[PDB]
Amino acid sequence: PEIKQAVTVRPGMCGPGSLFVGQLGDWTWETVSAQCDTDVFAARDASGNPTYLAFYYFRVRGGRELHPGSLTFGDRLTVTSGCYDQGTESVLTLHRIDRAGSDDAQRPLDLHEFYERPRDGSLYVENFNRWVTRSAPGSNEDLVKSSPPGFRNDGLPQLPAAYSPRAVYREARTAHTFRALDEPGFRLLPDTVEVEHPVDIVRDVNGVGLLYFASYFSMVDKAALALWRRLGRSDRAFLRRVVVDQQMCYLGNADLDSVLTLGARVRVSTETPGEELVDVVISDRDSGRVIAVSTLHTQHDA
Amino acid sequence: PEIKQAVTVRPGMCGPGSLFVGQLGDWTWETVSAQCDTDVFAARDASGNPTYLAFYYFRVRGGRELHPGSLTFGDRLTVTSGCYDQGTESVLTLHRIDRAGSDDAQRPLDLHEFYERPRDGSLYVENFNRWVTRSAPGSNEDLVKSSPPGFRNDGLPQLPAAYSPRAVYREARTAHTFRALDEPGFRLLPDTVEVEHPVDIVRDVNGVGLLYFASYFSMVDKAALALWRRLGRSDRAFLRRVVVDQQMCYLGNADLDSVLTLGARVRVSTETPGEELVDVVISDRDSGRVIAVSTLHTQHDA
């Protein structure tokens, strides 16, 4: 039983920051709760420790016709949501977003449609989430895999082998990009940036004292802005950027006194002017960990 | 017809940042939409310009037993919401939040209860909002009062004279505090800070290109943190602060290339140890405008 709902775009789920991905994550927790007969918000492991359904791999796919920067107050959307079986320790949640008028907004989720040929005018969200607990109270390092009792993955529809987010994130942690460096039609610019980012305790921290999943998207855009400025491009042009595809892998969290490093590089298209691929790696130098990788497929007019 | 709803605390509405006030503002727009027979999200003035139901005065009142820093993932709440007539150009929206178990969570909104003696264990939210339009496209200065056609304030219950948010915000713009400087039981410390804050285009900006109302709470906490650190207090102690009362007045918005100034001062209680009043003024020096005033009534254990 897929879920189909009418949404009107609110101030808390749009704009050039991370509010839309924050709202999508709330929707994911509601969708897993409904489909897996589990209260995700208050989940505890068999032993009684809180268990968080942590974001691990996050993709948002759009296009010139509908992307996250298209959305403004009062836009009417149709949202179709559903979970896919990834066993007892993980779960995949898909959301399709259409403009509520649109031809065929009533169509069900179509994996073929999500993994192979996304349609122009729809937005596609993939959230792969993993149950975790803390390994020590107040530590945000070395989180441990978990599963709350009664988590019902059984019955959920299955992905075919071709559609594996696991294959995708395994390659991205190795390559530090989601788009192979040897992919034709792009040139790697020499200009790169490295930004020191102390954890912002007033803006980066969630209600359980971890770094907030949506803050990782804010940190990647801070890196992307720093590279944009290194390229001599304007702050107003940054706000016109169209992100047609963004992938994020959350390899680690971090303690709230950490100083993170945000590294960014870009490949510009040889074929299409104003098209580029930006890669961002978030490091925690003091613990020697890479804690995130993101790739943004971007169209601009700077 | 007041609205009473069950809420489970989600990642997008808690934590030490501005997510709870962001969620409350979304709820306000839904409440005005329901009670005033108006689609606030897509509102336009009679002439066809977008009109925003802008936040102008915002209060959050709690206590040691339930405050915004109490809230964590999966907490079960009861929310009671309702609008009060302030004419065609403004509207007051109240929210009471109780823990869903609690004795007498079913009780209706009680102004006596909100303005005179708030109860321990309830959280009280006041949002006074004013319809505005831009005076020039792409300018965030010199916003103009408005009202969308068909806005139904008629029928809404009325406040008695004693309960005027107008008297409260008029005094705060004059004094740069919501708690009179001559109030007994407090001493003004000599330590103050002034922080330069360029508008953060990746975290401060909303879906219509204004500074986001919830970002004003992030900027006030940036000032408050800077003063806390000037006092030699610890970042971990900052995260244990209990804000029992916070008031915010939004006197202006600002263009996205602005450099703002965040000024903070504190009065410590003579009576109760670890109790203090922090005042923050946000200035836009280049336009010679004060664009916000906030006072935080805080309990700490630093």
Describe the structure.
It is classed as transferase/transferase inhibitor. Keywords: transferase, lyase, inhibitor, isostere, transferase-transferase inhibitor complex. The assembly is dimeric. LnmK in complex with 2-nitronate-propionyl-oxa(dethia)-CoA. The structure is a homodimer of 302-residue chains. Chain A is built from five helices and eleven strands, in the order βαβββαββαβααββββ. The longest helix of chain A has 18 residues, at 213-230. With 302 residues, chain A is α+β, with helices and mostly antiparallel strands. In chain A, strands 1, 2, 3, 4, 5, 6, 7, 8, 9, 10 and 11 form an eleven-stranded antiparallel sheet that branches. Chain A has one domain (1-302): Hotdog Thioesterase (Thiol Ester Dehydrase, Chain A, Roll). The first copy, chain A, has helices at 19-35, 111-115, 165-175, 213-230, 235-238; strands spanning 3-8, 52-61, 76-85, 90-99, 122-133, 144-145, 186-198, 242-250, 259-269, 275-284, 289-299.
List keywords for this structure.
homodimer; 302 residues; alpha+beta; Thiol Ester Dehydrase, Chain A; 11-stranded antiparallel β-sheet; 5 helices; globular; transferase/transferase inhibitor; transferase; inhibitor
